[PDB]
Amino acid sequence: PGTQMTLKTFHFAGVASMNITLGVPRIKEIINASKAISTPIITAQLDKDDDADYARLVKGRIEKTLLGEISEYIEEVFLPDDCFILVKLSLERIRLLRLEVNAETVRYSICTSKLRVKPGDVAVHGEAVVCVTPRENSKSSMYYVLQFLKEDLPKVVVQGIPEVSRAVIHIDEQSGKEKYKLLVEGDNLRAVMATHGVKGTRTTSNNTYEVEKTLGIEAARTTIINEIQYTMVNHGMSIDRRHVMLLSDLMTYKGEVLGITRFGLAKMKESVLMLASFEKTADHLFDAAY
């Protein structure tokens, strides 16, 4: 089938954006068992499928919002004693969109941010409207650390899964019931299957590695069946399932998903010349003489 593609596109998931790679390059990704697949797509099912309002709130939980988006102004304040970069935080945008953020939540997020603000020097003032990060202990601490913090303070993710970036809400066209399912482009299946309102029982992914880590090997067998048989009927190219029921069942029968690369052959085969006739003929012959 991979030989016979006419290389047509028209595979954007119907949202007219975020086209999924779907040809022999997708078949290569499923077979290679790459932990990183380009175009990772968790399709999620909402607990309430008829409310745009419910969908908007859930999308806010899944997607990542940076501090600068929610911060009205950001000023490095130099004072006769103590220079502190104090971020002014809007309280209307926090209310305008239903994001549950507070100065105490932001203060927790500012720490554990890789900005070295791990000490408790960061402080909360007023009513969720001002957070003050004073400075850092070392590494050009003077006004230098401050210059780095001011540029890197807006990037900190106040709320939402860091990994997911581009959640989109898709509406079904069925006349009797109009239903909304949010397709998220990202990789943390565990988190995106727990955020309140995403029904974990029906959330799925297109990365066998993410599924194998979160849902056993047997669900990782069924995605290797599905995501090959999904990308094979997408390109025309009909195929028996009994071929894919064999390729998946070979690929995951020794414990973990063993992708068919040079590396997965070593964990599948015992004999040397079958490995030695494949790639890395030098190392595989010396190591089996050792």
Partner 1 sequence: VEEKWRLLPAFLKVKGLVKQHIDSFNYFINVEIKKIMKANEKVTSDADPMWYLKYLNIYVGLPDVEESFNVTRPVSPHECRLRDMTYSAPITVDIEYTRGSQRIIRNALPIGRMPIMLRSSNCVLTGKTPAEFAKLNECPLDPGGYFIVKGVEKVILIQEQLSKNRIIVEADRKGAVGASVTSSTHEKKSRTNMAVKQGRFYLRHNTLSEDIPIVIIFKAMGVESDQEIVQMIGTEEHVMAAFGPSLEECQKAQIFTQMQALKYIGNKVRRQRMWGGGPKKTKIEEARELLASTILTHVPVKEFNFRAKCIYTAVMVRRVILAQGDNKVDDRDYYGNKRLELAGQLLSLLFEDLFKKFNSEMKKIADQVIPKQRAAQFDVVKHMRQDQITNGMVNAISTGNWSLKRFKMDRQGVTQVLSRLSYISALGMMTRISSQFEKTRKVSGPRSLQPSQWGMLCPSDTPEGEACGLVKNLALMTHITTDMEDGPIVKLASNLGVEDVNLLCGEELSYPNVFLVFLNGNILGVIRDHKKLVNTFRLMRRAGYINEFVSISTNLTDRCVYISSDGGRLCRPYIIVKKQKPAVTNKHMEELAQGYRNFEDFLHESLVEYLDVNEENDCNIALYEHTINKDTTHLEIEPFTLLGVCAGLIPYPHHNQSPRNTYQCAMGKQAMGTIGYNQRNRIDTLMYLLAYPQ
Partner 2 sequence: MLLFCPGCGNGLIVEEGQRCHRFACNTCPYVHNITRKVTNRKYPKLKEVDDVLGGAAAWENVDSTAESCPKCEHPRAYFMQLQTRSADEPMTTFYKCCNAQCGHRWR
Partner 3 sequence: KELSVIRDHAGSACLRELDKSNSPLTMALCGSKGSFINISQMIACVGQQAISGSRVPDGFENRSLPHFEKHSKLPAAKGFVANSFYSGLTPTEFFFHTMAGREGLVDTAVKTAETGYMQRRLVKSLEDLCSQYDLTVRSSTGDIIQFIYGGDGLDPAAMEGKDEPLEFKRVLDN
Partner DNA sequence: TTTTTTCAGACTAGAGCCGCTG
Partner DNA sequence: CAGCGGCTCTAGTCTGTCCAGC
Interacting residues with partner 2 (CB under 8 A): 52-53, 56, 65, 68-83, 90, 93, 96-97, 142-144, 146, 150, 154
- Give the residue among 188, 184, 183, 185 at the shortest CA–CA distance from 210: 188
Q: How far does Cα 56 stand from its chain's mean position?
A: 19
Residue 262, annotated as binding a ligand? yes
Residue number, 74 or 215, with CB nearest to partner 2: 74
**Sequence-distant (≥ 6) Cβ neighbours of residue 57 within 8 angstroms:** 98, 197
- Give the residue among 23, 66, 35, 38 at the shortest CA–CA distance from 185: 38
φ/ψ of 76, rounded to 5, equals -90, 115
CB atoms within 10 A of CB 174: 8
Least distance in Å: CB of 5 to partner 3? 7
Check residue 38 for interaction with partner 3 (CB under 8 A): no
**Sequence-distant (≥ 6) Cβ neighbours of residue 43 within 8 angstroms:** 181, 183, 203, 204
Residue 280, annotated as binding a ligand? yes
How far is the C-alpha of 89 from the C-alpha of 199, rounded, in Å?
33
Residue 116, annotated as binding a ligand? yes
Residue number, 67 or 258, with CB nearest to partner 2: 67
- Specify the pairing of strand 180-185 against strand 83-88: unpaired
What 3-state DSSP class applies to 177?
coil
In the list partner 3, partner 2, partner 1, none, the entry touching 278 (Cβ below 5 to 8 angstroms by class) is: partner 3
Check residue 269 for interaction with partner 3 (CB under 8 A): yes
In the list partner 1, partner 2, partner 3, none, the entry touching 148 (Cβ below 5 to 8 angstroms by class) is: partner 1
Check residue 12 for interaction with partner 3 (CB under 8 A): yes
Residues that bind DNA (CB under 7 A): 32, 34-36, 38, 116, 118-119, 261-263, 279-283
Residue numbers belonging to the annotated binding site for DNA = 116, 262, 280
Residues that bind partner 3 (CB under 8 A): 2-3, 5-7, 9-10, 12, 19, 24-25, 27-28, 31, 240-243, 245-247, 249-250, 253-254, 260-261, 264-265, 268-271, 274, 277-278
